[PDB]
Design a protein around this ligand. Sequence first.
Ligand SMILES: Nc1nc2c(ncn2[C@@H]2O[C@H](COP(=O)(O)OP(=O)(O)O)[C@@H](OP(=O)(O)NP(=O)(O)O)[C@H]2O)c(=O)[nH]1
Ligand SMILES: Nc1ncnc2c1ncn2[C@@H]1O[C@H](COP(=O)(O)O)[C@@H](O)[C@H]1O
Ligand SMILES: [Mg+2]
Ligand SMILES: [Mg+2]
Ligand SMILES: [Mn+2]
Length: 341
Amino acid sequence: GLWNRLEPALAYLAPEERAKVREAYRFAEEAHRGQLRRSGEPYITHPVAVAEILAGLQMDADTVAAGLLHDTLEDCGVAPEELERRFGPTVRRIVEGETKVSKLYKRRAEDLRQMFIAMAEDVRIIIVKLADRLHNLRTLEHMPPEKQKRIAQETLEIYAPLAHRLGMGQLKWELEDLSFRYLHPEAFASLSARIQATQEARERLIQKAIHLLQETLARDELLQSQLQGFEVTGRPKHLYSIWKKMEREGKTLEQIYDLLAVRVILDPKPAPTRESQALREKQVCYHVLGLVHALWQPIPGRVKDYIAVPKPNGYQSLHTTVIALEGLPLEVQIRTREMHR
Ligand SMILES: Nc1nc2c(ncn2[C@@H]2O[C@H](COP(=O)(O)OP(=O)(O)O)[C@@H](OP(=O)(O)NP(=O)(O)O)[C@H]2O)c(=O)[nH]1
Ligand SMILES: Nc1ncnc2c1ncn2[C@@H]1O[C@H](COP(=O)(O)O)[C@@H](O)[C@H]1O
Ligand SMILES: [Mg+2]
Ligand SMILES: [Mg+2]
Ligand SMILES: [Mn+2]
């Protein structure tokens, strides 16, 4: 069934691992047979969509499998002993933990308390709860408008930061943005309608900018001579982070440069002495700034030199807001590998 949708995403797993995931889906589909969600949809769609979220993150075989089974214990005729017998103790461990920790669709102080108590078992239990939470938020239109606000708050306070700390930034932004939609819809609808383009169009522009910079840097002869390699990463600013700093700093949306930002992480070639290495570390950063300014037109008064004036948090990097692509303000950040975090 819905399996033919999940199967391609599981290409990264060994054949034996994929068979485990199919045996898990076949068991979940048998266990969730005849069950429905709040949306008229059969229950199996939920554990498959959670297993999809985990598979997109290239998660552990037992983790993907545990995502298909994460609900087979709550008021279900499945004994935890059967999961240990069939899928091992690791799958059983995660699944018990995700069931015991307040489940999917239910004070919230006790459910956030249990979230920590499961922290001793393995962050693996959480990961699944993060995938589950993301899917729940994606299908929050089938929830009373009160319950919608309870979930959104919890997500912003507990899960989005946990995703952040686990290094799952694409999970983090989506968790934040869906939470923002249901928590403050008036602010969400105002800001979203203002932003003419969708996240599809945003990521397309960022990748055009990344290609333009990557090819411009690789074509500079003198730079590549003092360089070992480089990395051009992008980001479109997400609605929650756009609205968060407008309130925090006081700037209008027109007064946000970050709406399309790009980082240039550079690792220089090795140097004989310790000093001629620290000198090579800087010479590269300003050389990129030049090339960047010759590629995209720089905006007046937007060069921020944190190499020469580091932030009290020890932050070193060169910043410049430019006019890139279809006449759009793009922020560029130039730093070395060492100046990175
Ligand atoms: N990853 C990272 N980046 C750091 C850090 N300190 C400063 N920055 C950079 O510096 C930026 C903050 O400083 P600034 O860019 O010099 O300030 P303005 O953009 O307001 O001119 C940061 O921007 P942001 O969080 O993506 N944008 P915000 O929503 O706050 O407007 C980031 O680009 C840091 O510790 N880590
Ligand atoms: N210029 C940039 N290019 C790529 N990623 C960035 C850039 N600036 C910030 N980020 C990343 O985006 C996150 C913060 O972005 P924000 O949505 O503005 O709060 C962090 O995880 C940063 O690593
Ligand atoms: Mg500023
Ligand atoms: Mg940032
Ligand atoms: Mn669930």
